């Protein structure tokens, strides 16, 4: 079922990863917004912070 | 199971000829009611099956 | 003959709403942009000049039409 | 009434004009004309999704600059809104815009909601301390891969 | 050549007015206008290019 | 058969319109309008 | 079948599978035949516009 | 209304058709002369005279040019492209037809399409389709295929079918044999560098025009064009047109013809049933979809019928008989009968149908139900690749 | 014994006949046309002899020549993007799917 | 056209509006000629010389 | 300048449908 | 990259800024007092694709959400240069592909060993 | 199987699982593709109406050359932008004029690219080339024509034409201007003197009075004319409104009219109507439903 | 007879001498060229038919 | 909206049930015979009868007052009364109103006139 | 300030004032301008269409075998915008003695119908033989059932009209909608040739007939060319033809109408010699006709015209 | 047709010149749901209601 996980967050949403862990949770956003195209290697622009 | 299919054949007919007509024809199409197609459906049209004897 | 008396059902249902704009709300107008005035000069025979408020003057119009007229910071 | 229904003889009468016909003000009724498109309706209507004939009638919204626009403008530049760097001397373009919450608060549930004392200092840190976990990462080759799957995520 | 320096197509429109910030203005206009169609057919033209690349007959 | 029996109803009530209208003008005259004259 | 009338091909069909008179690819042409592509010229020219 | 005498032009200028600088009334002409647009000397000139007769013939025979236009016509016969086009430069009136016959013949046999193309258009739509002619269009197509051109061929193939504007208010449409002549040039050319698509397009306006029999109507045209100069009465039946040498031949190779499409369609199915595998066989070929052709004439047209059955079989065979004049079912027996094999292939959807490789299965799949990638789904698994297992729905 | 209550009886009995005929006629022609009905409008035929008085192609306007005589209500509605709407022009009434 | 205050009280938009531009770019025609399609060739012989 | 053509004639049309009916 | 970008921005009316509950209802402010109480909302009615009759968020005065078909803009990211894990299906084909020299060299998942094994 | 499988799909509606499909396909069995799979895609997405992707399909297909685009591919597109340029946009959108027309002038761009691509423009159906040769006739000119179109006959004759259908409204010659929309006040002061520093023609809808100030549906219940005072007017507008009711008339018009039967229930809130009535001497029972 | 047919001009006086106000509109350039796209009713009908 | 005399006799032979044919000859003395299915509603009458209610409606001219969906002729002598009482009959809001003008002269081939009104001006 | 006039878009002093748009303003465009798309004009050429067939077409259809067999005979005969000068003579000899041979009704009658259009543009008299000889038997005489094929007929028409014959009554009359119906698929030229014709002739009836026909039929009014019309309508001196057509000259257009008074005032004027044979004196028609044309036009004021003799009254 | 549900329209974006963009939390989930009395021991009893 995908409630499996529910207890560790009880009656918030489900979560697959530890939302307790800061690094974990921000790890897994950026690893959802890698595979949404949001995130990855881009040709560089002068605008883009290069330092 | 044979004649549910036979009689649901019968019935899919039925409504087949009602959509063919509504689908052709203009004046019934000029007053917009979805309401033309289902107000006569399987259960309303003829033949009707409890009036198959007489 | 008759054989029978009724009551007469009609029905009067408007659920469909066709409202069509007549064509004088689309027709132009001559709208404007407008500032306070903070002075005029006339000129046609004998220029006059008024003056209503005496600042330095960001924009300034001039017309020719019948009179020379010049509306500063207008 | 007049106005509505003058010398009308059915309601599809101005249907001659395609910008009119597909309106889909009164109803979808008038553009539903072949039983399979009738079906297909109650079909997708029922899995919850959206109407293709209510699509006869294309609406764009307003769109969410023109919104920001008006609310920014009904509200004098909405100083409860912006961040107090806004006020200071030149403020970058990030700072010249509305309070909207980020990604980046999501996994600290030290700060509950009001965060109490040195907690949003702690929390700043903490998202520091990602950031350089992320230039590690790609330095180092180990980014997240589209692909993959767990035990190469693991 | 890579980057800026290179292309298959250019076109130049060269803007005129009566006073100068007239025409720098219109050129602001022009080329935000230019920005945004741009962006809408490169992209199109982008997927197209990665169907391609995901494969294809010859 | 009912255009018979509705003509006849018509000329009844033509009748007693009739009726009306110079009894209760007091008689058979009546005024043209403003732009009679003409 | 390829003008629509399928009611009338119907009884043919069995005769035919009963007497083994049919073979693989003559099941394909059939089977394809009752989607009446005579009727779906009339159809698309006239009625479909 | 003014008018020009190039001849009688004076001094005096009698009819005073000049334009007078400072007499009475002058104003508004030369307001109306510094007005004129870009063309209008020339378009004035050009539309006075050179225009179509009242009985809808065209302006093209006048007695002054016409030495010059013999001279364009015999220029380009002996092959001189450049003269002649150098001559139709200095002509006045609209030249006629034969000109742009000539000069497009002349354009084939060096391939130059181009100018054949430009020639054609020149003559078509500004000179009042003086230019939309069978015999040139034909040339033009000729050209085409000269150039190996396919975008082209099927340009001068749309060209010829015209539209409304030059069909129905022009009036000048191609005639129904040429149709069929272009058409069947353009069709051979396609079938035999196997571009479906096209052969496809131009097929189903042979079928909707009603001209699949057409060749055999020409020949029997023929011999009923004899029949009348010695006296005796012309008839078209169905008996005369089966007495025709082409459709007596056909009906002859039909069953060697049958055989070769079976023999490779067999060998088609073999091959993919193999790379299938990846090379043994595979189960794919043991039963295809064709089946074999009973012993006899009657059988061999009846299997013919109900295989390849949407196309016309008969009249494919009859086209593919001649190749470049030479005639291929009475010398090259082989390289007849695999010409209408693989046109008759080419032709059919059903054979492509049939025809097809087996492709591998799509999984459907579902997301993962503890979100990681929305990239990694979880796939379905047929019964085949998983043995055992719980029993699951579809 | 009650029809006279109804429209198909007394005087409107003829009136329903002939509703019936034309309905019967009018299905002949469709079945001619491919079974696509022939336009409302009558616009579709080859006489004007042929299009019936009841057809909406009939024109009752205050006036034939004279177009600011020619509205539906008081003044001249407009439709969307103030196209006209009274009197429509051939390219505006379009036929599409 | 919902700004009620467009040139009364002084808005006068910096950029063209999208309903605008469309407006307008769909009043005119486009000339053919500007397509710029030749899969040919050059006509050598015959283009400069043709008819008067 | 009124009339331009010539009336019609007095003509009576409803006369032959009744007599008909 | 907001928090919640789909049911703030995309999802909701007022793009999260327009405050839908609130009521037409006559104030004593100041500024307020051309504001008139509102007759509550039509029963059965049908709205222009553009207005709602004002209840909820769900049904706000002004619809701001588009009708159309909502699509993500294509991702900048560069799918040509950018090496993925290998797959199943990729590494049975792998005799007959083309790579780069960095696709068989790759750093993280390199191809050639895996031709080899 | 799998073009019959997506354009199932795509009848339906469900373009997601169609291209998926078709992905597939392109990922591993490139070489077998045929146009058909386009051409469903292509049905499918007009159907959803997503013409965006209708066209983005068609691009492509002119991009790679091969299947190649057979004459019902070209029809489905271009019956897909037939519909997009039919469509409305909602009202906000709808002031000035319908905007979608734009998408026809695709049209022949769309055409030349059929040429490019060997498509022969002649198998389309009859009644698509109707709306393309319309949609031409909006948006295509030659460079011929383009030299003459200016001459100012033309425009006058089209002035002309619009005149004897009685449309003068739009035309830019032909409509005199004549209502000028007045400044707002502020609370700020009322003794600073506004001057107009420009002036445009704009359309009235931008600002009107809001339609709770103003009298209730003005174009049926009143009659208004715009006109201009024949008298000398020292100062002020020279034009007015004259304005009456539609239901107006001369306080004196019972004297105006002929006599009624009416005229001796003068002044009287409820008369007894079916006293003076007929029906009563008519009718033999007569009841009387009040 | 038809109500936008309206004086462009002013009734002629010495004012359109002694005076710089303009005699005619200046031109509209936002304003497109004016040309025939369109059809008869007859087309139309001929069309149908 | 004018009615032709094709559509007067269509209407004689097939009547509408809801269509109603509103005779508005003024002078009883010039009025001989009857349009078939007609109702009359003398034109002098007009104002005060479309301001009575159903009932007193029915009371006075004896038959039921049209309701404002449905389709009104109006007929008289030359078509001038009818057309006034058409402009009556059109601001109280009736919904289909419709003259036919040449009306009872064109049926019954009668000339008369409701108004005596002539072409000439008099000079000024 | 001048006799010259300012011109409104050059001068700095009208553009930048306080009516129109300063310099200094933000320069965007003010409104759109929707013209073309909100109302279109059809279009209308002042000059008539350059390559238009301008003739009776006369449809030939023939199965591409008799086409090809009779190739000799018909390469004689008018093929598409192409007319051969063979003498008539010849080419009815051919087919009098090759026609009997070949067996097809349809491939006759296509073949008769190329002989006559032949005949008919070079006006040869003695081609209605045929008619009487082949055709009469089965289409014309004693309510013959069969139904002519429509290109036989156009020819045999357009054969009437070219050479004026009073035998085209007869046809025309079987053409209306209880004969076979043809009427409706006439050209515009057909019309045109028909009543220029009828009207050197002189038939007020004829005239009178066929424009009730050309009307019911919805032909093209406006563009049946104006030569012909005028001629009819000069044929035209009893009473009750006469009220028919002025009641009918309402269905002209404008323009139309315009350009009858002007052809009208030609062909009795200059132009008398462009045609072969003279018109008729017809005073009344002429006067009638530019009456109508007067009427129908917009109306201009010449007020020292109109009031030229007005005294003020004091009555 | 009176205009009131024009001015109802008018009125509310008057009204909206007053109202803050509300705190939607830090974490927004979690906000949402408490808000909602899902999670764990965020159950808030009805308010007590005197009787009739
Ligand atoms: O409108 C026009 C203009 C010119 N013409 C020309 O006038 C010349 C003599 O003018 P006619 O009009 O008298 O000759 P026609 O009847 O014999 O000519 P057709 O129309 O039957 O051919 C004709 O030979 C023709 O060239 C017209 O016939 N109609």
Redesign the interface.
């Given at each position: 079922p995908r409630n499996l996980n529910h207890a560790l967050n009880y009656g918030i949403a489900n979560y697959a990863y530890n939302r307790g862990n800061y690094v974990e949770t921000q790890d897994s956003i950026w690893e959802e917004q890698t595979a949404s195209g949001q995130e990855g290697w881009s040709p560089a622009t002068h605008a883009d912070g290069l330092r | 199971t044979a004649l549910w299919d036979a009689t649901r054949k019968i019935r899919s007919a039925k409504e087949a000829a009602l959509h063919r007509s509504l689908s052709h024809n203009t004046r019934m199409r000029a007053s917009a009611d979805l309401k033309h197609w289902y107000e006569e459906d399987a259960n309303t049209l003829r033949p009707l099956a409890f009036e198959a004897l007489k | 003959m008759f054989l029978i008396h009724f009551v007469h059902y009609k029905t009067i249902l408007q659920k469909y709403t066709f409202k069509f704009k007549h064509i004088f709300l689309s027709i132009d107008k001559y709208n404007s942009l407008f500032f306070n005035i903070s002075g005029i000069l006339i000129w046609l025979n004998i220029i006059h000049i008024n003056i209503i408020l005496i600042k330095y003057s960001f924009f300034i119009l001039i017309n020719?039409?019948?009179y020379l007229i010049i509306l500063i910071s207008t | 009434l007049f106005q509505q229904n003058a010398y009308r003889k059915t309601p599809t009468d101005e249907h001659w004009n395609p910008y009119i016909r597909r309106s889909t003000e009164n109803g979808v009724g008038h553009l539903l004309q072949n039983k399979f498109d009738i079906m297909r309706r109650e079909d997708r209507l029922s899995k919850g999704e959206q109407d293709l004939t209510e699509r006869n009638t294309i609406h764009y919204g307003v769109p969410i600059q023109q919104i920001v626009d008006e609310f920014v403008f009904r509200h004098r530049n909405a100083r409860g809104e912006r961040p107090l760097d806004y006020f200071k001397p030149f403020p970058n373009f990030r700072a010249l815009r509305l309070n909207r919450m980020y990604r980046d608060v999501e996994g600290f549930s030290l700060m509950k909601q009001r965060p109490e004392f040195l907690e949003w200092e702690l929390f700043t840190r903490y998202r520091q301390h990602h950031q350089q976990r992320r230039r590690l990462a790609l330095l180092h080759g180990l980014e997240p891969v589209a692909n993959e799957t767990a035990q190469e995520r693991d | 050549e890579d980057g800026i320096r290179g292309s298959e197509v250019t076109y130049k429109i060269v803007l005129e007015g009566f006073w100068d910030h007239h025409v720098m203005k219109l050129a602001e206009d022009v080329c935000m206008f230019l920005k945004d169609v741009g962006r809408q057919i490169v992209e199109e033209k982008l997927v197209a290019v990665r169907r391609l690349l995901q494969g294809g007959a010859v | 058969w009912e255009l018979s029996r509705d003509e006849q109803l018509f000329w009844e009530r033509v009748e007693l319109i009739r009726k009306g209208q110079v009894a209760s003008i007091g008689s058979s005259h009546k005024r043209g309008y403003a732009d009679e004259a003409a | 079948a390829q003008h629509g009338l399928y009611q009338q091909a119907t009884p043919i069909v069995d005769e035919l599978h009963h007497q083994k008179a049919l073979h693989a690819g003559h099941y394909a042409l059939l089977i394809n035949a009752l989607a009446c592509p005579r009727l779906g010229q009339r159809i698309l020219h006239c009625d479909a516009q | 209304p003014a008018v020009v005498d190039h001849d009688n032009i004076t001094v005096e200028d009698p009819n005073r058709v000049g334009l007078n600088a400072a007499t009475l009334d002058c104003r508004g002409r030369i307001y109306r002369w510094l007005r004129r647009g870009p063309f209008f000397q020339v378009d004035n000139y050009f539309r006075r005279s050179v225009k179509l007769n009242r009985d809808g013939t065209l302006p093209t025979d006048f007695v002054h040019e016409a030495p010059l236009m013999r001279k364009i016509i015999r220029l380009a016969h002996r092959g001189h492209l450049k003269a002649a086009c150098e001559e139709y430069r200095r002509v006045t009136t609209v030249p006629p037809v034969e000109v742009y016959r000539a000069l497009t013949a002349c354009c084939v046999p060096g391939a130059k399409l181009a100018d054949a193309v430009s020639i054609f258009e020149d003559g078509d739509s500004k000179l009042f389709y003086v230019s939309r002619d069978g015999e040139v269009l034909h040339n033009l197509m000729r050209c085409a295929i000269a150039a190996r051109h396919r975008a082209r061929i099927m340009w001068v193939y749309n060209v010829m079918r015209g539209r409304f504007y030059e069909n129905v208010v022009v009036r000048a449409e191609v005639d129904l044999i040429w149709r069929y002549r272009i058409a069947m040039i353009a069709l051979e050319y396609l079938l035999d560098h196997e571009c479906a698509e096209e052969a496809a397009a131009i097929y189903s306006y042979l079928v909707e025009e009603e001209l699949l029999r057409c060749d055999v109507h020409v020949r029997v045209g023929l011999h009923m064009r004899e029949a009348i100069a010695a006296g005796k009465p012309i008839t078209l039946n169905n008996d005369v047109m089966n007495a025709t040498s082409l459709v007596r031949d056909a009906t002859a190779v039909a069953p060697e013809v049958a055989r070769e499409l079976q023999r490779r369609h067999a060998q088609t199915l073999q091959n993919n049933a193999v790379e299938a595998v990846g090379a043994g066989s595979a189960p794919w070929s043991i039963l295809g979809p064709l089946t074999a052709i009973g012993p006899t004439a009657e059988d061999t047209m009846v299997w013919l019928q109900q295989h390849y059955g949407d196309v016309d079989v008969m009249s494919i065979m009859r086209w593919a008989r001649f190749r470049k004049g030479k005639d291929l079912m009475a010398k090259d027996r082989p390289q007849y009968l695999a010409r209408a094999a693989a046109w008759i292939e080419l032709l059919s959807k059903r054979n492509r149908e049939m025809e097809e490789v087996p492709l591998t299965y799509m999984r459907k799949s579902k997301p993962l139900v503890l979100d990681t990638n929305s990239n990694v789904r979880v796939a379905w698994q047929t019964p085949l690749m998983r043995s055992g297992g719980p029993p699951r729905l579809l | 014994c009650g029809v006279n209550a109804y429209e198909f009886g007394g005087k409107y009995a003829r009136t329903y006949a002939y509703a019936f005929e034309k309905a019967k006629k009018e299905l002949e022609a469709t079945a001619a046309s491919g079974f696509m009905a022939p336009?409302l409008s009558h616009?579709?035929?080859?006489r004007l002899s042929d299009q019936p008085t009841t057809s909406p192609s009939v024109d009752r306007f205050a006036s034939t020549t004279?177009?600011?005589q020619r509205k539906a209500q008081f003044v001249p509605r407009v439709g969307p993007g103030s196209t006209p709407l009274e009197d429509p022009?051939?390219?505006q009434?379009s036929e599409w799917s | 056209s919902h700004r009620r205050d467009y040139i009364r009280m002084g808005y006068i938009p910096r950029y063209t509006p999208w309903e605008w531009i469309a407006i307008?770019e769909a009043?005119?025609?486009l000339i053919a000629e500007q397509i710029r399609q030749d899969n040919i060739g050059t006509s050598y012989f015959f283009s400069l010389n043709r008819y008067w | 300048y009124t009339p331009i053509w010539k009336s019609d004639p007095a003509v009576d049309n409803v006369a032959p449908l009744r007599d008909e009916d | 990259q907001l928090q919640a970008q789909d049911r703030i921005i995309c999802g909701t009316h007022g793009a999260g800024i327009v405050a839908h509950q609130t009521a037409v209802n006559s104030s004593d402010n100041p500024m307020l007092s051309s504001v008139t109480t509102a007759a509550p909302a039509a029963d059965l009615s049908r709205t222009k694709p553009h207005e709602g009759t004002g209840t909820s968020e769900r049904d706000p005065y002004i619809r701001t959400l588009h009708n159309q078909r909502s699509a993500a803009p294509e991702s900048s990211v560069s799918q040509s240069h950018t090496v993925n894990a290998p797959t199943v299906d990729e590494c049975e084909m792998l005799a007959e592909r083309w790579g780069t020299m960095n696709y068989w060299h790759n750093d993280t998942f390199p191809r050639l060993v895996v031709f080899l094994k | 199987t799998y073009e019959l499988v997506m354009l199932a799909l795509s009848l339906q509606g469900n373009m997601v699982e169609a291209e998926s499909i078709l992905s597939f396909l392109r990922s591993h069995h490139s070489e077998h593709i045929t146009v058909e799979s386009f051409n469903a895609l292509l049905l499918g997405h007009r159907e959803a109406r997503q013409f965006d992707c209708c066209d983005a399909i068609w691009q492509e297909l002119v991009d790679r050359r091969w299947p190649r685009a057979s004459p019902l591919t070209a029809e489905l597109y271009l019956r897909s932008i037939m519909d997009h340029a039919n469509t409305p946009t909602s009202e906000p959108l709808q002031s000035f004029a319908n905007i979608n027309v734009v998408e026809k002038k695709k049209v022949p761009l769309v055409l030349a690219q059929m040429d490019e691509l060997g498509v022969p423009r002649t198998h389309l159906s009859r009644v698509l080339m109707?709306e393309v040769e319309?949609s031409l006739?909006?948006f295509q000119?030659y460079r011929s024509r383009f030299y003459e179109?200016?001459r100012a006959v033309?425009?006058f004759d089209?002035?002309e034409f619009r005149?004897r259908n009685?449309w003068?409204?739009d035309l830019?010659?032909?409509?005199?201007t004549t209502k000028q929309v007045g400044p707002l006040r502020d609370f700020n002061d009322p003794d600073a003197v506004q001057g107009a520093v420009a002036t445009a023609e704009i359309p009235a809808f931008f600002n009107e009075r809001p339609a709770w100030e103003r009298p209730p549906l003005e174009e049926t219940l009143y009659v208004t004319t715009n006109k201009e005072r024949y008298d000398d007017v020292r100062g002020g507008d020279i034009y007015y409104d004259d304005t009456r009711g539609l239901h107006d008339r001369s306080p004196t018009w019972m004297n105006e009219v002929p006599e009624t039967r009416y005229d001796r229930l003068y002044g009287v809130n409820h008369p007894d109507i079916a006293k003076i009535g007929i029906r009563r001497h008519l009718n033999v029972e007569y009841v009387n439903r009040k | 007879?038809?109500?936008?047919?309206?004086?462009?001009t002013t009734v002629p006086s010495y004012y359109?001498?002694?005076?710089?106000?303009?005699?005619?509109?200046?031109?509209?350039?936002?304003?497109?060229?004016?040309?025939?796209?369109?059809?008869?009713?007859?087309?139309?009908?001929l069309?149908?038919? | 909206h004018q009615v032709y005399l094709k559509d007067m006799l269509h209407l004689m032979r097939y009547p509408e049930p809801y269509t109603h044919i509103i005779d508005c000859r003024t002078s009883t003395q010039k009025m001989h015979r009857w349009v078939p299915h007609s109702l009359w509603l003398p034109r002098d009458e007009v104002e005060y009868a479309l301001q009575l209610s159903a009932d007193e409606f029915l009371d006075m001219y004896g038959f039921r007052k049209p309701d404002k969906s449905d389709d009104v002729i109006l007929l008289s002598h030359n078509g001038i009364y009818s057309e006034q009482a058409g402009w009556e009959w059109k601001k109280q809001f009736f919904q289909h109103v419709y003259n036919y003008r040449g009306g009872t002269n064109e049926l019954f081939g009668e000339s008369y006139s409701d108004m005596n009104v002539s072409d000439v001006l008099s000079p000024w | 300030?001048?006799?010259t006039?300012?011109?409104?878009?050059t001068?700095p002093?009208?553009?930048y004032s306080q009516y129109?748009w300063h310099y200094n303003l933000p320069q965007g465009?003010?409104?759109?301008?929707s013209?073309?798309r909100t109302f279109?004009?059809?279009?209308?050429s002042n000059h008539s269409l350059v390559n238009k067939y301008r003739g009776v077409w006369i449809e030939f259809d023939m199965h591409p075998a008799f086409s090809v067999a009779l190739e000799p005979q018909l390469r004689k005969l008018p093929r598409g915008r192409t007319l051969p000068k063979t003498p008539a003579e010849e080419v009815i000899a051919d087919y009098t003695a090759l026609a009997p041979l070949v067996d097809d009704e349809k491939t006759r009658d296509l073949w008769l119908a190329k002989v006559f259009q032949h005949c008919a543009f070079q006006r040869c008299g003695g081609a209605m033989e045929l008619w009487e000889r082949y055709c009469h038997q089965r289409f014309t005489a004693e309510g013959a059932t069969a139904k002519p094929p429509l290109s036989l007929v156009k020819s045999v028409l357009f054969y009437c009209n070219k050479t004026d014959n009073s035998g085209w009554r007869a046809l025309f009359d079987r053409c209306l909608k209880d004969g076979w119906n043809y009427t409706p698929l006439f050209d515009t030229a057909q019309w045109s040739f028909m009543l220029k014709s009828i009207g050197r002739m002189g038939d007020e009836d004829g005239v009178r007939a066929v424009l009730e026909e050309m009307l019911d039929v919805?032909a093209?009014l406006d563009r049946v060319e104006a030569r012909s019309v005028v001629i009819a309508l000069n044929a035209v001196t009893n009473a009750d033809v006469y009220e028919f057509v002025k009641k009918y000259l309402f269905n002209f257009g404008e323009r139309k109408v315009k350009f009858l008074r002007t052809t009208y005032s030609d062909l009795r004027g200059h132009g008398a010699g462009k045609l072969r044979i003279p018109l008729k004196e017809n005073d009344n028609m002429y006067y009638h006709v530019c009456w109508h044309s007067s009427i129908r036009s917009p109306r201009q004021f010449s007020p020292r015209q109109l009031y030229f003799d007005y005294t003020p009254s004091t009555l | 047709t009176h205009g009131l549900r024009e001015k109802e329209k008018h009125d509310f974006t008057i009204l909206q010149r007053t109202v803050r963009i509300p705190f939607q939390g830090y974490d927004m989930d979690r906000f949402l749901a408490q808000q909602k009395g899902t999670p764990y021991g965020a159950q808030q009893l009805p308010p007590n209601v005197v009787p009739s």
């Open positions: - | - | 020719n039409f019948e | - | - | - | - | - | 336009s616009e579709d035929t080859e004279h177009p600011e022009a051939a390219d009434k | 307008q009043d005119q025609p | - | - | 109707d319309d006739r909006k000119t179109w200016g033309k425009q089209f002035i005149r009685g003068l409204y830019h010659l032909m409509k005199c | 007879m038809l109500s936008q047919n309206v004086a462009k359109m001498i002694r005076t710089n106000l303009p005699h005619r509109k200046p031109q509209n350039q936002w304003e497109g060229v004016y040309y025939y796209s369109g059809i008869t009713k007859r087309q139309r009908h069309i149908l038919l | - | 300030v001048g006799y006039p300012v011109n409104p878009d001068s002093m009208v553009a129109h465009m003010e409104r759109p301008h013209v073309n279109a004009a059809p279009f209308q919805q093209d | -």
